[PDB]
Design a binder for this molecule. Structure first.
Ligand SMILES: [Mg+2]
Ligand SMILES: [Mg+2]
Ligand SMILES: [Mg+2]
Ligand SMILES: [Mg+2]
Ligand SMILES: [Mg+2]
Ligand SMILES: [Mg+2]
Ligand SMILES: [Mg+2]
Ligand SMILES: [Mg+2]
Ligand SMILES: [Mg+2]
Ligand SMILES: [Mg+2]
Ligand SMILES: [Mg+2]
Ligand SMILES: [Mg+2]
Ligand SMILES: [Mg+2]
Ligand SMILES: [Mg+2]
Ligand SMILES: [Mg+2]
Ligand SMILES: [Mg+2]
Ligand SMILES: [Mg+2]
Ligand SMILES: [Mg+2]
Ligand SMILES: [Mg+2]
Ligand SMILES: [Mg+2]
Ligand SMILES: [Mg+2]
Ligand SMILES: [Mg+2]
Ligand SMILES: [Mg+2]
Ligand SMILES: [Mg+2]
Ligand SMILES: [Mg+2]
Ligand SMILES: [Mg+2]
Ligand SMILES: [Mg+2]
Ligand SMILES: [Mg+2]
Ligand SMILES: [Mg+2]
Ligand SMILES: [Mg+2]
Ligand SMILES: [Mg+2]
Ligand SMILES: [Mg+2]
Ligand SMILES: [Mg+2]
Ligand SMILES: [Mg+2]
Ligand SMILES: [Mg+2]
Ligand SMILES: [Mg+2]
Ligand SMILES: [Mg+2]
Ligand SMILES: [Mg+2]
Ligand SMILES: [Mg+2]
Ligand SMILES: [Mg+2]
Ligand SMILES: [Mg+2]
Ligand SMILES: [Mg+2]
Ligand SMILES: [Mg+2]
Ligand SMILES: [Mg+2]
Ligand SMILES: [Mg+2]
Ligand SMILES: [Mg+2]
Ligand SMILES: [Mg+2]
Ligand SMILES: [Mg+2]
Ligand SMILES: [Mg+2]
Ligand SMILES: [Mg+2]
Ligand SMILES: [Mg+2]
Ligand SMILES: [Mg+2]
Ligand SMILES: [Mg+2]
Ligand SMILES: [Mg+2]
Ligand SMILES: [Mg+2]
Ligand SMILES: [Mg+2]
Ligand SMILES: [Mg+2]
Ligand SMILES: [Mg+2]
Ligand SMILES: [Mg+2]
Ligand SMILES: [Mg+2]
Ligand SMILES: [Mg+2]
Ligand SMILES: [Mg+2]
Ligand SMILES: [Mg+2]
Ligand SMILES: [Mg+2]
Ligand SMILES: [Mg+2]
Ligand SMILES: [Mg+2]
Ligand SMILES: [Mg+2]
Ligand SMILES: [Mg+2]
Ligand SMILES: [Mg+2]
Ligand SMILES: [Mg+2]
Ligand SMILES: [Mg+2]
Ligand SMILES: [Mg+2]
Ligand SMILES: [Mg+2]
Ligand SMILES: [Mg+2]
Ligand SMILES: [Mg+2]
Ligand SMILES: [Mg+2]
Ligand SMILES: [Mg+2]
Ligand SMILES: [Mg+2]
Ligand SMILES: [Mg+2]
Lengths: 60, 253, 49, 96
RNA sequence: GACCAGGCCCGGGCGACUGUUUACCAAAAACACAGGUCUCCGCAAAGUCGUAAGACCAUGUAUGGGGGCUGACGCCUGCC
RNA sequence: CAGGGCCUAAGAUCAGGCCGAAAGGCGUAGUCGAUGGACAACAGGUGAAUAUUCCUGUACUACCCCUUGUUGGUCCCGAGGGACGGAGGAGGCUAGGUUAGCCGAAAGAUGGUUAUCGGUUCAAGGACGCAAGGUGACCCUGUUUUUCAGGGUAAGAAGGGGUAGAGAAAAUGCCUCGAGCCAAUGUUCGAGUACCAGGCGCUACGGCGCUGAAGUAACCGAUGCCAUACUCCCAGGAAAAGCUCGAACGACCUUCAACAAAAGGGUACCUGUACCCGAAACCGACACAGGUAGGUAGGUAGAGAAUACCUAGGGGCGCGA
RNA sequence: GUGAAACUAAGUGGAGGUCCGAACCGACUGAUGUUGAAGAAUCAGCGGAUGAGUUGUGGUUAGGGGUGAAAUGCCACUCG
């Protein structure tokens, strides 16, 4: 019943950082290649979807 | 007949879950999925604990096989499920061992069974557990024995040699009328978690070797074909030289 | 001698039924907390809703 | 059994950073006998209780922490009803 | 007495039926289906995925598991 | 209160292990992983912006502290329990609602009239308790079998005890003792100098200080509670920990050490907490006629959570003439 | 009803991919919209609504692939 463009819905931050998170990119070799080449471009933010385990941004 | 008990320690919840998905997570075995959650009953197929006297307390339904199953007690308080033999009634008594009466539900090595007997739940390998003829209404006759080897006629009609020291159980497997049911509606398939199958002829060429000819397709394939490109009809797949071959005598007809 | 057994088993019974019932209210309160009509004050401002 | 490890390793003299003086806090003193102290985020309640209990030499009923949206821990320290708050308010320099 | 609240009948084709489907031009006579039938498979099964190890099939065992065509029920299914 | 300091599902990672040009792939114990299991708090007040969090009342968990009572406790292991479907209807009840009764005010410029308008509220928790409810075998006689009445049978229910086998607990077999049991709800404390219609006075005319009457009954009645209670069906309906029980095996600790109890006093880990959330704050590039899980469910008419007109509460659509 | 059984009202019972119909899921016709209020809507009607149902949270399968009640459909407004 929802429009095509609605692909990005309200999804728990917990779920997202379990996907694009830091600790995930660290696991695979391809991820470490990721972080090298982000660091090369010198991005202010390495992993965009990340998330505090507990704190002000914490998902329960 | 079917009256639910509380849970004996033989009924657990641990099991494979993705049905038809392998490690890679792919559907290997097509059409499964959906259907009622089940619990695994731990059957005793080996019947290995010898020389104690068991009593059939009840008869229970099992979702994992079309046969019935019987809860039996012992004088030792151990409880086991066995496949329900045909005609066995509650209050009955069974026993396994070597020198034993021959009646329904007793299990013994093939050295001691009088030729002509109707047998089920047949080990092919010493102490591996019973393997052959476990389904509803399945039975195999012990036709002849010679040397170290016994000869059976399996429910497929195939005649085959096995070891004379492999245990088996007297009597046919119960619930004979099961294939007399008529499911009657689609939903009643789905309840068993058997999902709908598409005919080859329907799908597009990419998807299957009988691919869409314009209106309706005769199968132009010079031969009926597996999804994967093999002849569908009458091509024997039995591994040419399997170790088994020396044992097998006449082939199912 | 039968009066001893009866008074001991009524002591036990009173105990078990006490703990049982305590347990039961607790469980109810929990269910309600999950659903979210809990503090009976809360329900009593929405009664007419 | 063993030495009692404090929840983290901090150095107690840095945990109580400062009294927070605004119109708000002062009447928490008046009504509640409760001081208001900005403290180190890394600091706990047991640490704060020992710290004030020894430092100003007052027995403290209960502590309540808070964490600002700015990431700075803030603590309501409600002393006992024997020790008056305004005592420590004059002793410190917080004037009601 | 407002709001709310079935037009119905006589025919024929197709598909038995409830279902599914071309997100955003096609909802059907297409797909599924219960049922039928052919064929493979004796358990270290056939089949599928993997370079392999192994996984599914199945913690099942021929009244079960693959695959092909047809498509309820009724009458049938001829020659080469 | 919600997560973490507890437990596991799908799944994920995976010591050693098997395989593989490399990166890696499979996989066992282990360890992660809630959308589930376990586990203790409510009413009133304050309130520029927080409140089951702060205040005042009664509570409740987990430890520690002392008295008393025992001598072995602790983990590892053995067990019971936790522990589970759908559909159906019948009960027994509350929540709400309506009408009386009691109480206070009332004149609302009209032909009449008090037939009018307000109030009648209270939680968690603790003690008690259970029938017209539901369950407790059979046989004879009747009430329609049923709710029942007389007799009888000897475990015949929740619930306990004993014994036997390699056998502690358990499971299993034999023996015995028990006619009650079950749980929503109810009575009483909590609870009144609480709350509240009005009344009095101030008005920075915003709000404020002051004193407070009655506080019961009947009939409707749930989709909520007992309740995993029943009856039926086939498609046959999670695990693990806390919890209860317990000998041998192994490890460790041991006397004012540890455990067992009823009181008494004490003691109290992190993180979330603003605001919006049928949205102008999320998702749609917009202050966009759209999408967004759950909870609470008043009146009159009505079969109804449809519809119409309304209460509480919220709004009059950010261009007008 | 006969000795067995069959046959037939009755009551009880509450089956169903039953019926009508809100929520909810869809998307059949028409009108409007077409530099839209909106990159698929609004309005009036319409289909299913105890099931082969709907949905939440957390997961799975990945491009010589996956998934498909099969439309070359879908795989972040992109899919021979
Ligand atoms: Mg961004
Ligand atoms: Mg179970
Ligand atoms: Mg159990
Ligand atoms: Mg994987
Ligand atoms: Mg088909
Ligand atoms: Mg096609
Ligand atoms: Mg494709
Ligand atoms: Mg494929
Ligand atoms: Mg081809
Ligand atoms: Mg073709
Ligand atoms: Mg043609
Ligand atoms: Mg309403
Ligand atoms: Mg404050
Ligand atoms: Mg806090
Ligand atoms: Mg027609
Ligand atoms: Mg014509
Ligand atoms: Mg059709
Ligand atoms: Mg679909
Ligand atoms: Mg279309
Ligand atoms: Mg259609
Ligand atoms: Mg269309
Ligand atoms: Mg189609
Ligand atoms: Mg078929
Ligand atoms: Mg194979
Ligand atoms: Mg066809
Ligand atoms: Mg697992
Ligand atoms: Mg791995
Ligand atoms: Mg390794
Ligand atoms: Mg593992
Ligand atoms: Mg965890
Ligand atoms: Mg949870
Ligand atoms: Mg907790
Ligand atoms: Mg809690
Ligand atoms: Mg507020
Ligand atoms: Mg409050
Ligand atoms: Mg009070
Ligand atoms: Mg306690
Ligand atoms: Mg255990
Ligand atoms: Mg459960
Ligand atoms: Mg009822
Ligand atoms: Mg009432
Ligand atoms: Mg009236
Ligand atoms: Mg009167
Ligand atoms: Mg007048
Ligand atoms: Mg009145
Ligand atoms: Mg009470
Ligand atoms: Mg008490
Ligand atoms: Mg009674
Ligand atoms: Mg014993
Ligand atoms: Mg003994
Ligand atoms: Mg016993
Ligand atoms: Mg009534
Ligand atoms: Mg309902
Ligand atoms: Mg049941
Ligand atoms: Mg020992
Ligand atoms: Mg003890
Ligand atoms: Mg808050
Ligand atoms: Mg709030
Ligand atoms: Mg909106
Ligand atoms: Mg606007
Ligand atoms: Mg809008
Ligand atoms: Mg209404
Ligand atoms: Mg009407
Ligand atoms: Mg009415
Ligand atoms: Mg309405
Ligand atoms: Mg209004
Ligand atoms: Mg229907
Ligand atoms: Mg219909
Ligand atoms: Mg669709
Ligand atoms: Mg519409
Ligand atoms: Mg409709
Ligand atoms: Mg309908
Ligand atoms: Mg049904
Ligand atoms: Mg969806
Ligand atoms: Mg589909
Ligand atoms: Mg085409
Ligand atoms: Mg993209
Ligand atoms: Mg797309
Ligand atoms: Mg396309």
């Amino acid at each position: 019943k929802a429009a095509l463009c609605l692909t990005k819905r309200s999804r728990s931050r917990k779920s997202l950082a379990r996907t694009h998170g830091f600790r995930l990119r660290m696991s695979t070799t391809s991820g470490r290649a990721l972080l090298k080449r982000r660091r090369a471009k010198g991005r202010k933010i390495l992993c965009t979807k990340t998330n505090p385990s507990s704190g002000k941004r914490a998902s329960p | 007949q079917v009256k639910s008990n509380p849970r004996n320690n033989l009924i657990s919840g641990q099991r494979r879950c993705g049905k038809g998905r392998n490690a890679r997570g792919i559907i290997t075995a097509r059409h499964r999925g959906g259907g009622h959650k089940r619990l695994y009953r731990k059957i005793d197929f080996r019947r290995n604990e010898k020389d104690i006297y068991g009593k059939i307390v009840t008869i229970e339904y099992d979702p994992n096989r079309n046969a019935y199953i019987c809860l039996i007690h012992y004088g030792d308080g151990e409880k086991r499920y066995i496949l329900h033999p045909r005609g066995a009634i509650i209050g009955d008594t069974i026993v396994s061992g070597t020198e034993v009466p021959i009646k329904m539900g007793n299990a013994l090595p093939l050295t001691d069974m009088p030729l002509g007997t109707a047998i089920h739940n047949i080990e092919i390998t010493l102490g591996r557990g019973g393997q052959l003829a476990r389904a509803a209404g399945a039975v195999a006759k012990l036709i002849a024995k010679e040397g170290k080897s016994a000869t059976l006629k399996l429910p497929s009609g195939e005649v085959r040699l096995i070891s004379k020291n492999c245990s088996a159980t007297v009597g046919q497997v119960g619930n004979v009328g099961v294939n007399q049911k008529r499911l009657g509606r689609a939903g009643s398939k789905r309840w068993l978690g058997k999902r709908p199958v598409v005919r080859g002829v329907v799908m597009n060429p990419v998807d299957h070797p009988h691919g869409g000819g314009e209106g309706r397709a005769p199968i132009g394939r010079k031969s009926p074909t597996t999804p994967w490109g093999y002849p569908a009809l009458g091509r024997r797949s039995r591994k040419r030289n399997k170790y088994s071959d020396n044992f097998i005598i006449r082939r199912r007809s | 001698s039968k009066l001893q057994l009866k008074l001991e088993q009524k002591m036990k019974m009173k105990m078990a039924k006490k703990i049982r019932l305590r347990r039961n209210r607790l469980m109810r309160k929990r269910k309600l907390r999950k659903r979210g009509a809990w503090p009976p004050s809360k329900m009593k401002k929405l009664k007419n809703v | 059994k063993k030495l009692k490890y404090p929840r983290r390793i901090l150095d107690v003299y840095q945990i109580l950073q400062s009294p927070i003086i605004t119109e708000a806090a002062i009447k928490n003193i008046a009504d509640e006998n409760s001081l208001l102290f900005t403290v180190d985020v890394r600091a706990d309640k047991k640490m704060i209780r020992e710290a004030i209990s020894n430092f100003f030499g007052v027995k403290v009923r209960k502590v309540n922490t808070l964490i600002r949206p700015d990431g700075t821990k803030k603590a309501y320290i409600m002393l006992n009803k024997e020790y008056n708050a305004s005592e420590l308010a004059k002793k410190i320099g917080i004037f009601p």
